[PDB]
Amino acid sequence: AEEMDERRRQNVAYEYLCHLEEAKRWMEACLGEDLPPTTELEEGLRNGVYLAKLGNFFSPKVVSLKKIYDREQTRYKATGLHFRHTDNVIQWLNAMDEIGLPKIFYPETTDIYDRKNMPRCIYCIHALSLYLFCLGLAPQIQDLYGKVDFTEEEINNMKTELEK
Amino acid sequence: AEEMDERRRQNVAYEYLCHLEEAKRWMEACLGEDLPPTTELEEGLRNGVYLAKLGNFFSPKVVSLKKIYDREQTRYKATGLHFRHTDNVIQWLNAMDEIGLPKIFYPETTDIYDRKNMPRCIYCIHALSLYLFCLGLAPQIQDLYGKVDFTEEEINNMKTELEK
């Protein structure tokens, strides 16, 4: 009866994983290339490369692919996050400003680069998706709530990651 | 220099106040009636009455005005929040489900009734606004970011309310 409060925590993790899976698939549909596994997506968005490419996808006037830093993520795979990656996240923010996505949905650079608040970044991706679908500039993001499943392991990992 | 963090926290509060002001004005435009002062809006949405009315505004097929509990908020002004008010929030959620607003934006009833996460409800109001504007079912929410001002006291109250 109190362990159910523990299940609630499990449900919250599960739900979030579905929204990550949805964001993942949508970006892959837009970019025409694969993104990391749903379970590693958050860490995989930190260097801002995918977000910058997404930025080019709907606002090519503001986001130049050749101006993206570590566009192939070679620097990232070798060493880790580099301050310069921060500009990628900034190009994405600028792209969204250009197309008119209301400011309220924007995460801050630190929220994604320093992973201070990745969920805020995922929710923003979902709002951008809805806004883009509105303007007929991108396909509709999918609704995988109860369609997809994850292992116990994956849910636990997300659960404790979500906690502290 | 260390004082920088304080200005930041202040900015976050200021920003949020602007989005509350935007949500406030938009709902008033939709409902044709006044809502509480921007500084008291969050507390003023708790009984779910305004949200249910908003629900009727874009989904009259799902939300009948005559089925809203304490519609005139007479009970609310007299006594305080009452459990039945919870149904009002639920009607709003159902209204949004009916028009197809993606579930990811939905706060839980406890988030607004128990005020467990009011910002989550304001965020969803903005997502709903964008969506509705898209379907031509409502006017566009305005961008008041730097057009609206608040007292130091107000920004401060929101700041500490946002922290602890």
From Swiss-Prot, chains A, B:
- Membrane-spanning regions, if any? none
Instruction: List modified residues, type Phosphotyrosine.
Output: Y145
Q: Write out the tissue specificity statement of the associated record.
A: Expressed in the placenta, lung, and kidney. A lower level expression is seen in the heart, liver, skeletal muscle and pancreas.
Q: Where is the Calponin-homology (CH) domain?
A: 17-132
Lineage top rank: taxon: Eukaryota
The subcellular location is: Cell membrane; Nucleus; Cytoplasm; Cytoplasm, Cell cortex
Q: How does it assemble?
A: Interacts with CDC42; the interaction is demonstrated with IQGAP1 in GTP-bound and in nucleotide-free state. Interacts with RAC1. Does not interact with RHOA. Interacts with TSG101. Interacts with PAK6. Interacts with TMEM14B; this interaction increases IQGAP1 phosphorylation and induces its nuclear translocation. Interacts with SASH1. Interacts with PJVK. Interacts with SLC26A4; this interaction enhances the chloride-bicarbonate exchange activity of SLC26A4. Interacts with SVEP1. Interacts with ILK; the interaction is required for localization of IQGAP to the cell cortex. (Microbial infection) Interacts with ebolavirus vp40.
Q: What does this protein do?
A: Plays a crucial role in regulating the dynamics and assembly of the actin cytoskeleton. Recruited to the cell cortex by interaction with ILK which allows it to cooperate with its effector DIAPH1 to locally stabilize microtubules and allow stable insertion of caveolae into the plasma membrane. Binds to activated CDC42 but does not stimulate its GTPase activity. Associates with calmodulin. May promote neurite outgrowth. May play a possible role in cell cycle regulation by contributing to cell cycle progression after DNA replication arrest.
Q: What is this protein called?
A: Ras GTPase-activating-like protein IQGAP1
Please report the organism this UniProt entry assigns to the protein.
Homo sapiens (Human)
Q: Which residues of the full protein are shown?
A: 28 to 191 of 1657
